[PDB]
Write a protein that binds this ligand. Sequence first.
Ligand SMILES: C=C(C)CCOP(=O)(O)OP(=O)(O)O
Ligand SMILES: C=C(C)CCOP(=O)(O)OP(=O)(O)O
Ligand SMILES: C=C(C)CCOP(=O)(O)OP(=O)(O)O
Ligand SMILES: [Mg+2]
Ligand SMILES: [Mg+2]
Ligand SMILES: [Mg+2]
Ligand SMILES: [Mg+2]
Lengths: 316, 307
Amino acid sequence: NKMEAKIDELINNDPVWSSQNESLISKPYNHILLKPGKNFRLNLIVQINRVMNLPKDQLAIVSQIVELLHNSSLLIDDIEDNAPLRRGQTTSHLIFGVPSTINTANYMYFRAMQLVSQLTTKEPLYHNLITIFNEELINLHRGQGLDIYWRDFLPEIIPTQEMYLNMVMNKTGGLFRLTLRLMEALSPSGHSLVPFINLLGIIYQIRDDYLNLKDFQMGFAEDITEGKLSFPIVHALNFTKTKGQTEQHNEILRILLLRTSDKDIKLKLIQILEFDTNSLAYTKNFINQLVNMIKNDNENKYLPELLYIIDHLSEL
Amino acid sequence: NKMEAKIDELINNDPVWSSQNESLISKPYNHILLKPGKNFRLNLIVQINRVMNLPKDQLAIVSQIVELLHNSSLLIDDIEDNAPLRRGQTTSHLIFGVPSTINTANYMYFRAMQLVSQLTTKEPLYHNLITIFNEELINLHRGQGLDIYWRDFLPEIIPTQEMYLNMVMNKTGGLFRLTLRLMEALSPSSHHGHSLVPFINLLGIIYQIRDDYLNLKDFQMSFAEDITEGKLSFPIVHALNFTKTKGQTEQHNEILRILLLRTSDKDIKLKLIQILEFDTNSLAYTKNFINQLVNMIKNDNENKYLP
Ligand SMILES: C=C(C)CCOP(=O)(O)OP(=O)(O)O
Ligand SMILES: C=C(C)CCOP(=O)(O)OP(=O)(O)O
Ligand SMILES: C=C(C)CCOP(=O)(O)OP(=O)(O)O
Ligand SMILES: [Mg+2]
Ligand SMILES: [Mg+2]
Ligand SMILES: [Mg+2]
Ligand SMILES: [Mg+2]
């Protein structure tokens, strides 16, 4: 009966959770926190707020939600991408293991969700805040799904430029739109800045893909080891199909499929994209055109310190 | 000019997502759907609705939300537990890879969350369903994190029977309580009696202890993957704390060594089992523990837990 009394007191109570248990399972998350770039995701929110005007207490919460979602996404992305480093540091799953990292990352998504309720007391608004959160996280998982599928089942599907851009609108545009849509919904205060935040996500991503190869040609071109269907690689694959460069098209697939860390093999692929397909110049120029679409936006049809961010978008 | 036009169209529209795309991402999930148990998790929902009386359309969505969370939880748990099999079938991550499986599973978490807003249009009630959904998924992750922590840090921390039971209230109680708390908040029924959460908690507990018990018993009588996983099973927690108390130092260490082996070796697995069989009598202890738990419900004449 002391057993039953114990079982009885157990089931008539909320589940026990100590602050100690909380520390033990937050290890993978505390590790990625030791990484920079933070002050920048914070500079973008701060700038957009000059327009949205939410009180600083609400802006702090919007910011905590996004940081939890962002860092958790990277903890996961690194398992998904077999990444050994993130922001010059050893990846969490390599230290604590994939099991703990996945669980903790998923855990933080729900803490993030929890915080949405500290943004309002109003039910109509709260319901909309949750829908935005739910929607963009659904979008993030969709693009991430395609990026991962194209790569892992290559050459089953060779994405075209169009397909890549759609994948990026979901994948990368997910959190960008999330942050902005929350702010536009909490604003006490012109046209929606969503097309502009979308163009930013796109630029951010093609730039991430591009710089990952160009800095090795001049990091470690880890994208090649991953086998990622990046902007430069998507152009090269399609370009070779179109110009009938069979041998080169196949060599590109062969190298991607090696998941190689050999610097010379990676450098060969890059030099193929440089001189054979001209995928690097194409990408650098595609980036510039997108940036000009904003820099030449006088009539403010995209646009509402703003541009300073566009050139330091790599540090977010 | 034409490139700028295309980008303009793109950024002014919602992200494009086709049904073929939906089919691609769904592959790891669909693969697990070829699995039984469904006419039983759904059986419990049915039964309890006899007291809750939710209108079918609403009950089905609950059934849907529960199914997505459960199947998704299993996809991830198998990755976390390095499980090669689930219901006799090759686990999803061994077929589609860990990357796609993790992504798909999480996606389904959010799809499940989406179904929550289609349970009701009343803004007060909806908020409660979300808080419910949110709270239990958090407990689920807390328990899972602890079950994984003990295992992966062994032998840093060896839980006591009590710590184990608390871990289970979180991990396994989560989905059980989420299912019932939703149904109770939706119930059109005036006063369907005392809340059934205490009863669903005891159920969750019996369920997990029995799961750990059966993993070893169906191997002592004839794969015992919990040993290969190195899991702090209910019988294992009992054996470890039983040898520590009876000062049986060498048996205590032998148990730890085998769990730390992460072994698939039949002989060695048989060896750990014979220790629990003859040395600590942990399997008989577990069987009896389960029976006591059940008797709490069987001899519930004043219906304190039962409806
Ligand atoms: C969930 C998101 C948006 C992260 C995607 O990152 P990528 O795998 O595309 O590249 P890195 O962020 O690791 O540079
Ligand atoms: C959460 C635990 C311990 C078991 C999960 O699987 P079930 O016992 O519910 O069985 P199936 O859903 O896989 O049929
Ligand atoms: C997320 C939950 C609740 C499933 C936990 O199942 P276990 O980790 O106990 O392992 P299985 O025996 O169910 O495979
Ligand atoms: Mg990555
Ligand atoms: Mg990635
Ligand atoms: Mg398991
Ligand atoms: Mg498990």
